[PDB]
């Protein structure tokens, strides 16, 4: 059987000048509880002397 088909339009926003992370995870594993995302990052690229 062939049931239907969908034409999908993705996100078209670039989010300039912001550092963002997107996560897609199968949710049956964690059960009822919500997931709390924490990241271990470095931070701003500053301007230092030559």
């Amino acid at each position: 059987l062939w049931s239907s088909y969908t034409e999908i339009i993705d996100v078209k926003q670039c989010y300039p000048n912001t550092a963002l992370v997107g996560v897609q995870v199968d949710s049956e594993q964690f059960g009822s509880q919500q997931v709390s995302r924490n990241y271990h990052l470095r931070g701003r690229i500053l301007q230092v002397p030559s």
Binding site: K12, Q13, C14, Y15, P16, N17
Partner: protein
């Protein structure tokens, strides 16, 4: 160098309003005059102003550089 009216982070995440300055470095738009500040079509360069709304940005086809973050108000609710 006085610090009376200044708050440091200074950039607000808004759901429907763009915080950039029009034709600035961050908006990155440079082209013919398109619309008014009330989303009315125009061609005179003197009275071309962005309304900071999503339609005002769509007039420029510059949706990519939109300052605000759409559909936050669904989550904040």
């Amino acid at each position: 160098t006085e610090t009376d009216g200044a708050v440091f982070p200074g950039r607000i995440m808004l759901a429907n309003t763009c915080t950039w300055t029009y034709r600035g470095d961050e908006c990155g738009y440079s082209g013919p005059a398109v619309a008014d500040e009330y989303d009315q079509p125009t061609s005179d360069i003197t009275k071309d102003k962005c309304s900071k709304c999503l339609s005002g940005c769509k007039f420029r086809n510059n949706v990519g550089n939109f300052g605000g973050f759409l559909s936050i108000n669904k989550l904040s609710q």
